[PDB]
Structure 1
Amino acid sequence: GLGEEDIPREPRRIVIHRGSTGLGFNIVGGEDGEGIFISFILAGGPADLSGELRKGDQILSVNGVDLRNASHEQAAIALKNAGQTVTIIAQYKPEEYSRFE
């Protein structure tokens, strides 16, 4: 269901169409048990145009690839190779994100 600021608490599917330089975000984590978290959304990039991804979203999977325990590089390679239409399963975890970052 919806959390305090109208973001689903549960995992949610977000579709990104790739742009000239990528998907328009950056990630941290993938080490010491920290998952893959969105840390940056490029202004005017695909993720920002979509408007659904947020800083503090954990990327749980992309196009059938589980990233819950992936390394940072494994996640970066999976995003690079996911195709022109990328289906991301994300979960909004701003408190957990803040504890790590």
Structure 2
Amino acid sequence: EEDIPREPRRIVIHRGSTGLGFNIVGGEGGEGIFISFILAGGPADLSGELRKGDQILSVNGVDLRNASHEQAAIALKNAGQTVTIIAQYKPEEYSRFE
């Protein structure tokens, strides 16, 4: 994680037979949408850029900063084959909630 920056970053993922290759938690109370799980060999893993503890801020221009979990899952499912994710790495906040 030496190369993950503090600020939001852009990551392009291509959907496959196991979706985008990650699952999400949060979207409630003080907790935004966080990646909780990255599937080995799936797209997010292959890319090598996303991490457990990333907050998802936007998906293809759909703002998820204040989305509920279901709003985020719908946005992710409907974002098409090529998906641009704006993510911000917040491992301490992730651990606080999860």
TM-score (norm 1): 0.94
Work out the percentage of aligned pairs sharing the same amino acid: 99
Task: Tell me how far 1:16 sits from its aligned partner.
Answer: 0.2
Q: How many residues align?
A: 98
Stretches of 4+ aligned residues off by more than 3 angstroms: none
Q: Which runs of 5+ in 1 are unaligned?
A: none
Contact 1:14 1:89 in 2 (8 A): yes
Task: Tell me how far 1:25 sits from its aligned partner.
Answer: 0.2
Higher strand share: 2
TM-score (norm 2): 0.96
Deviation per CA, 1:9-50: give whole Å up to 9, x if none: 000000001101200000000011210000000010010011
Match of 2:57 in 1: 60
Q: CA RMSD in A?
A: 1.0
Q: Distance in 2 between matches of 1:44 and 1:21?
A: 10
Q: Which runs of 5+ in 2 are unaligned?
A: none
